[PDB]
Paper text:
[name] is a large, 374 kDa member of a broadly conserved family of [name] factors (also called Mule, Lasu, Ureb1, Arf-BP1, HectH9/E3^Histone^, Ptr1, Upl1, or Eel-1;). This family is characterized by a large N-terminal domain attached to a smaller C-terminal HECT domain (Homologous to E6-AP Carboxyl Terminus) that provides ubiquitin ligase activity ([Fig fig1]). [name] has been implicated in the turnover of excess levels of small, basic proteins including ribosomal components and histones. We determined cryo-EM structures of [name] to reveal a helical repeat solenoid architecture for the 2,888 residues preceding the C-terminal HECT domain and an overall architecture that resembles the published structures of [name] but with a larger fraction of ordered residues.
Residue numbers in the entry: 2 to 153, 159 to 213, 236 to 1532, 1539 to 1872, 2220 to 2276
Write the structure that this text describes.
Amino acid sequence: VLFTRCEKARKEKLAAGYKPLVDYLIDCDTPTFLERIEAIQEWDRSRDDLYVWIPILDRMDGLLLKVAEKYKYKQDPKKECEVKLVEMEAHDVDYCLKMLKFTRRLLLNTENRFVYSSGDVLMYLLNCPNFTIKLAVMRILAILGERFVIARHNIFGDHNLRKKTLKLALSLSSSVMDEDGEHFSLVDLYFDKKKVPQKWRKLRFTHIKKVTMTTQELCEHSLQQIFDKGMALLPAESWFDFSIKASVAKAFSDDSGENIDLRNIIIETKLNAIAFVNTIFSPPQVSSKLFELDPYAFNSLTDLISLSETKIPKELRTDALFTLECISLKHVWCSDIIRNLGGNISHGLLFQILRYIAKTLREATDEIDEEYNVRFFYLISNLADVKPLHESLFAAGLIPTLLEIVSIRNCPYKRTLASATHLLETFIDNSETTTEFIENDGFTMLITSVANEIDFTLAHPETWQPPKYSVVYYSISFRELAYIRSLLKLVLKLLSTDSGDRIRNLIDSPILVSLKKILENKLVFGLTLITYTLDVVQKVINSEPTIYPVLVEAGLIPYVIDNFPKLIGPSAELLSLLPDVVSAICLNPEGLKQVKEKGLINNLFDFLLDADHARILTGGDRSTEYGTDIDELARHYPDLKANIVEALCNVIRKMPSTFRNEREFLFTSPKDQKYFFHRKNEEILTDKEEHEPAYWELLDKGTMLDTFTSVLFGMSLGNGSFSQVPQHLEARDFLAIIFMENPPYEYFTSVAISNVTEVLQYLDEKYEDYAFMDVMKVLNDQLENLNDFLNSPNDRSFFLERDGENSVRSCHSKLCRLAAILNIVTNVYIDLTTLSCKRIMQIYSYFDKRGFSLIKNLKLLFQKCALEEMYIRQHMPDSVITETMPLPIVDVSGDGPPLQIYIDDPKKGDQKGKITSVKTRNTLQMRTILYTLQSNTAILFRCFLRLSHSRNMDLEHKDLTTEVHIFENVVENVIEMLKATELEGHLPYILVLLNFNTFVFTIPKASPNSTEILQTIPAYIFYQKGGYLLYLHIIRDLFTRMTKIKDLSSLDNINYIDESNGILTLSCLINALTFYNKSMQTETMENVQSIGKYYVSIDDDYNIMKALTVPIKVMALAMILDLDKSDSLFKTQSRNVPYSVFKQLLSMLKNIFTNVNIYTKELYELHWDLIFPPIKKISLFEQVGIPGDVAANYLTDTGDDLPADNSIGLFSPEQWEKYKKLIGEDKSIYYPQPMQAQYYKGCSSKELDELRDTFFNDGLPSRIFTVLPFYPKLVNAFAKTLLQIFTKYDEPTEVFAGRILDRILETDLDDPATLSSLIHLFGIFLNEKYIYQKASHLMQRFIEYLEKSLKPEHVNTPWFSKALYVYEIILAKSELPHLEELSKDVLLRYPLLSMAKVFRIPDPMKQKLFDILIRVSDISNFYSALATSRILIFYSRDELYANNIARSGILSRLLKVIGSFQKLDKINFLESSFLLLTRRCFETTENVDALIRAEINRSFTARPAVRELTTILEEKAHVVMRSPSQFIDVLCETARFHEFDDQGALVDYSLKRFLGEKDKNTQASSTEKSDIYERTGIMHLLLSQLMAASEKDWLSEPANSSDLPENKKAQLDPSRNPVCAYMIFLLKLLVELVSSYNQCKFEFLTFSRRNTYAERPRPRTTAINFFLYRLLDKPVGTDHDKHEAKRREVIGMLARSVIIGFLATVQDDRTTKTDVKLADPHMNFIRKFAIEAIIKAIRNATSSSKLLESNHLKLDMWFRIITSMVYVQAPYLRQLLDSNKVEADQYQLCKLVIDLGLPSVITEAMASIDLNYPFSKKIFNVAVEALNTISSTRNNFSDGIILKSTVSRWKDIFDMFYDSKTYANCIIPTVINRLYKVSLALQKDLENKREQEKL
C-alpha cells in the first residue's frame, strides 16, 4: 500500500467509517465469519475502497494460507518438485470457495483494488487438482488482470504462473474436428445435435514419453486414482498438465448426470484463463501463444453470450461475456469482436441482445441477469472507443435501440437503466450522435424521466433502502440515487450542444420544479445529486442569462440563496462548484446585491474551518483550483473584493481558536518509562507498526491548514483580492495559523509549510515591510523561551538527563515550532539567492533596534543541537542509528550543515525499514528536528556574514558600522563554540563544528562546479580574534592523535565517514587543513577593497584580501616546521601520514611559497565602533554637547583629530571640562590599533620571508627524494610545490632536474616504485617550456639511459609507463616541423618573431628505441599498453615505421590487453589509442596527399585575397602535423599568395586561391598491385578476434549488479557483457577501417582463418558469411532477456554498418567531381562479390521451407541490409563519407541490384512461403519494404557509439599530443622562404604591370 502521506491520512480516516462493517466480520469465531461472508452478495451502496476491506482480506488470506499447507498445495517457486496431486476434501472445498467466491463479489464492487496483496496464495491455490478451486482462483486472477491493464503485483511476471495461465487457456479446444460435423464448437456441447468427438472422450498425454488411458479406464478409476496413477509414471514437472488433461478426459468420459457439471467448470476456467492471458500478455504474444494454438476462440465466445438461449449455463454466459470485456480493452480485437457479434448490421446479435434485454425489463420475469446487462454495456462502451466502430454502431441503430431501454417507465431494475444511461453519455460525442438523439425525441424523454423519478422517489418513502455499513448523506436506495445521477449527467452533456434549444426544452417541462425538490430535500437525495442539480442551474444561467427571471419564478435561485449554507457538505465535487454557482447568481444585479448581503461569500470560506470539509477538498490541485476560482469571481465582479477580503480575514482570524491538543507525539516505552535509549547495548522491542510516524495529515489541523494554505496559494497568483489582505489583516494574525503551539515533528515538511512559503514569498515581493519584522520577533521570542534548553550543561544530553519527565515532551514541542519558523525564515526572507537591497536594510534595522540577542541564541541552538545528536548517538545501538538517520528529507540535499556521521556505506543503498519500536520512533523524531535546527541555523549564519557583499551596494556610515557589527558578533560566537568543547570524547562534535565553520565562512560556487569562495571580512575578523590560532592548536592536537593510530593504510580507502576514532580524527584534520588552505589562496578569497574604506587613521593602505594571507602563512609555515622537528614527516620510511593529509600539506606549501605583491608591516584590527566617523568618538560627543553631524564633518576635515587640549570653535566651556574629565588618558582606544603577534614572534611579511628562507635552506627540497618513493599516488603535487618553491627562490630548475636524473642513473631496477615516481617527476618537470629549453643535455642523457637500460622485458613493471611518458614528452616536441630560416631578403618587414627551439633526437636513437619497443612481449599492464600506443602513434607517421609496427605482431599483444581489461573504466583511452594507431597503419602517402589537398582547398571556400595564413595553419594544425612536407608541397601548387606590399616586402599573410596559378603541372598514377599486394595482416587479426569473441557469451548479462540490479543499469547498460564490449570495440574499429581506407577492403574481401599466402589472394567469403550467418547465429530467442535483445540489436546495427561501409566508396580528393558517374571496376568488383553472397544466401534460406523456419531471423536482416544499401544509410554511420559522394553510391548500388537480378530474387523468396508460418508476416513485410526502396530510389535517377572520419581522427591525435594549435605556425617561414620570390614577386609585378602595360 504505497500511498502518499496525504492519501494515507485520507484513507485511514475513510476506513474509520467502516468500523461497524469490520467489527461485524472480524469479531466472529470462523464458521460464523463465512456465514456472514456468504450474505453480502449485492452491494446497495457505491463502489467501496478495498483499503477499508483489507482486514477481512487478511483474515481470509490467513484462513487460506492454513488450508493450503494442509494439502501441501503450498508451492515454493524454486523447487520444481511440484505440489503432489491430491484431490482436496469435499467439505474443505466449501470452506475454500465460500471465501474465494466472495473475493469476486468484493473485487467487482470495489475500487483502489491495486492494494490487493493475496496474489501469492492464489499461485499456491492454483496448484490444486480440483478445478472448482482453480475456477474461482482464475476468476479472481482475471479480475485483477483487468484492473492492471486498465491501470496502464509483481506476480504478473512470474513465468510459472504465465505458463499455468497459457495452458489453462489452451485447455480443451474450442473446436477441432468431428467425422459428421465441422468442428463441434463448445456451444454444441449443450445441443443434442453433434456427439462429443471421441478424441476428447479418451486420454493420451505425453511429457520421449507416451501414456494412454483410453476410455473404460477413465470411466472406472476415480479422479484421485487417475491423478495418482499418472504422476507415478510422469515426472513431477508435468503433473499439472496431466491433471488438466485427465480431468478433461474424465469429465467428457461419460455423459453422466454430473460429468457435464465438471465440463462446465473446465470451460469456465478456460475462458477466465483466456481473459487473464489477454490482460498480462502483449497482443502479439497473445496471438502467437494463445490464438495460434486455438484460432476458434472468438467464433465460440460470440456464440455463448445470448440471453435468448435458456440452456447455456447462466455462469458460462457471464464468464464468456466477461472475457470479452477484457479482450476489448485492446482495440485490435474489437474489430473482430464486432464482426463476430454483428455490431455492423442492425439485425445482428449485438442488437438482438439489446432488444431481449428490453423485453425482459418490460416484463420482469426473473430472467434479468443485471450483471449480464451491465457487462454488455461495458463491452459496447469499449467497442465504442474505436472511432471506426463508433461510427459502425451509430449507423447500425445503437441509439434508436438504446433509447428503447431508457424510455421504459416505472421499471424497478435501476442497475441496468443506470448503465444504459452511462453508455448513452459515453457514446454521444459528435454532432451526428447528438442530433440523432435529439431527433428521436431523446432530450424530451430524458427530462420527463428525471422529473418522474424525482417525483416518485419523494412521494414513496417506503421504497428507500439506504446502506447500513457506510457513511452516506442520502436516505434513498443507491440504485435510485445512481439512476438519477446518470440521467442528470447526460442532461449536462447534452447541454454543451446548442444549449439555446435544450434550455428552451427544459423550460417547457416539469424539470425545474422537480429540481427544487432535490434542493429542498438534501437529507434524502444526498450530495452527489445536489452537485449535479446545481451544475445545471449554473450551466443554464451561463449560457442563457435571459433565463434568470424564469429560474427566479420557479423558486430555485430564491431557495439557492436563502439556503446556501444548508447546501454545503463534505463532497469534493460539491465544493468545486460553489465559486461557479456564485458567478452565475451574480449575473443579475439583484442577484449580486443579494450575494453581497446574506453573506454568500462568508459561506465560501467558513466551511474550511471544519476538518471533514477540508479533508475532502484535499489540499492539492482541487484545493488550489478552488482558490483560483475565487479570484476569478473577484475579477468578473470587482464589487465583491470587499467581501472576499472581509471573509478571508475573518477565517484567518478564527482558525487559531480551532486548534486543540489532539494527540501526543512522544511515547514512553512500556517497560522502563524512558523515551530514549541509554546504552549502545539495550534490547530492542521490535514492533510491526510503521517505522516513520505520521501525525500531521491525521490531525484536525493538518487537513484544515493543508487545504487553506492551498486555497491561499491558488489565490496569490497575480494581484487580486488576496493582495489587499495585508491592508486589512495584521501580520501577527497571519502568523498564528502557521506557527502552531504544538506541531508534530513533520510539520516543517508538510504542504502547509510548502504552500505558505509561496504565499509569504508573494506577500514579500509586494509588501516587503509586512511580515518580516514580525517573523523575526516570533523567532527571537521562541528562541527566548528555550532559555533552559539552550543554557544547559554541555557535558550531557539535556534530553537523556530527564528521560521520562514531561520536559522531554514540552521541549520537543517547542523545537518543532522552532523548526517550522526557521524553515520559513530561510526560505522566504533570508535567502542568499533572494537577498534584495531592502531586505539587507531591514536586517540592519532589526539588528540596530532589537539588538544582537538573536545571534547569541542561534549559536547556542546549533551548539546544543550538535551536542544532543552526539550524546544521543553515544547511547543508541548502531542499528538504531542507521534507522533514525534523518537526512532523507524532502527538498534537503545535505551538501552543507550538520555533517552526517554514518555507520553503513550510504552508497550501498537504504537501511531503513528493518526495525522499529517506541524508542526507535522517539529518537527518529528527535534526530530529525535536531537536523533542521542545525541545517537552517547554518544557512542563517552564511547569510548573516555575506549581507551587502552579495549586492555590492554602496553603504552609508551607519549602514557599514552595523554590517561590520553583525560580522563581529557572528564570528565571536563561531569562536566561542570552538573554544568551548575539548576534542577528547567530542570528536564527532568537532567534525560538525569544523564543517559548519567552513560553510558559514564561504560563499556558494557561482558556477557549475567552481568552488566555495572565502568571505574575506568575516575571515579577517576571525583572525583578528584568534580564529586561526585555534585551528593550529586543534591541528597540533589532531596530529598526535593521527600518529598513534595503528592502521593508517586502511584510512586511504574510505568513502563514507563512519564513527571510528580513526576516520573521525582524519576528517577533522582535512576540514581544518582545508579551511586553512582556503584562506591562503587569493583565488579562493573574496577580493574586498582596501582598508582605507573603513579606517583613515592608518599608515599603509593595503588590500585586505592580500594582506590577510601573510599572517596566515607565517603561522602555517611555523607549525609545519615544528612538525618536521618532531620526527613526523620529511623523515622515516613508514609513511606516518595518510595520502589525503599529505595532499593538503603539499598544497599548503605551494601557497606558503606563492608571493603576493604586498609588503605588510602591521595589520589593524577591524572594529565597528572605530570605523571612520569613529562611533567610539561620535557617540562620546553625543554624550556631551552634540555637534550633530558637525562632529562628523569635524573629523572628516581634521583627519580624525581629537580636540587637543582646548575648546576651539566649538565645545562650549561647560561642554569642555567634561570632554576633559572624560577622554581618559588612553587616547589609543579611539584609533585602530595594530594586531598582536600570533604563535610566531611576528606575523609580518618580513617574518614570512625569514621563515621561507629557513625552510628553503634546510634542503627539504633535497629531502624530497626521501619522501617521494612512498607517496607515488601524488607526484604532480610534489612537482608543482617544488616548481613554485624554486620560482619563489629564483634558482635554475635545470639543476634540480639534473639532480633527479643522477638519482635515476644510480637507482637499482630492484626498486620499481622509486623509479616510477622519480621518472614521473622528471617527466612532469620537462613538461614546462621555461625549463624544457634548458634541458637538452638532460634529455640526451635520458635517451642514452633508456637505450642502455630499457629492455622489452620491463613492459610489466610500473616504471615503464612513466619512462615512455617522459620519452613521449621529448618525442612530441622532437617531431615538430623542422624550422626553416628566411633567406634572400624575403622582407615583409614586421620582424617575423622566431619560435622557441626544440631538442632534436638523433635519428639512430629513434630507430634504436623503436627496435626495442616493437619487440616487447605479452603485456599485463594497462598503462604500459597505453604508453606504448601513444609512443607508436608518432613512429607510425612514417610509412617505413608503420610497416615494421604491423609486421612486428605488437598489435596482437595490444589487442590482448584490450580484451582482458574490458571492465576497467579507463579502457576507453586504450581503445582510442589503438583505433588511431591502426588507422595510421593503413594511411599512405597517396591517401594522405589526397586528403591534405582536399582539406586546404576546402578551407579556401568558407562561403561566409583571403584566408590569412596564420589562420589556416591554426585551424588545420592536425592536417599540417600529419605530414608537414606534403602540406607545404600541395600548398605551393596553389594559394600563390597576394598582397606583395607597395615596396614588395609583404605586409600581410592573406593568400589568394590562385586557381590555376603556378599552372596545372601534374603527374599520373595507377595504383593496383600495391593494395592487391598489401596483405598488411591487421585485418586478419581483427577478424580473428571478432570471430573468436562470437563464440563466447556476448549476450549473457554478467553475474549480477549488487546495488542497481533493478535500477540504474537495468538494460541501460549493454556493454556489461565483457565480450560484448570487446565485440563492440572491434566492430566499431572494423566499420571505421572498412569505410575509410580502400586497402582495408581488400583484406576484408580476402580474409581467411588460415593466413596462407597467395599472390592476389582469392576473394574468399568467410568474413561475409560470418557477418551474415554466423555472427548473429546465437539461437537464444526464447524467454524475454531484455539485455540479450538489446545486445543483439546493437550488434545487428554494427554489423549492418560494417557491410555498408564495406560497400561504400572512400571519401577522397574527388569532391566536386561527384557529377562523374563512371564508378570503379574494383569498387564494382567488391559489390558484385558482396551482393552475390546475399543472393546466394537467400536462395538457400528460401528453398526447403524447413530451412526457412531456421533462417527466419537472418532473413529479417538480409532484407534490411538491402534497404540500407540502396538508401545508402546505416546506423552510426554518415559521419565518415562525403554527402557529395553519396549520389553514385545509392545510384550505382541500385543499378547493380537491378542488373544483378535482385528485384526478383526477393519475389521468388515470397513465392515460397507457406503463409501459415507466423513470421511470414514479418518476412513478407520487410521483403516488400526492400522492394519499395529499390523502386523508390530507382525513380529519382530516371546511443553511446561515436564514429569519426579520418581527418577528425588526425584532430584527435593532435589534441592528445600537441596542446597548442600555434605549433603549426612554425612552418610559416618555410612557405615564406618558399613561394614569394617566385610567386608573389613574379605574379604581382607581372599581373599589375601587364594590365597597366595593356594601356
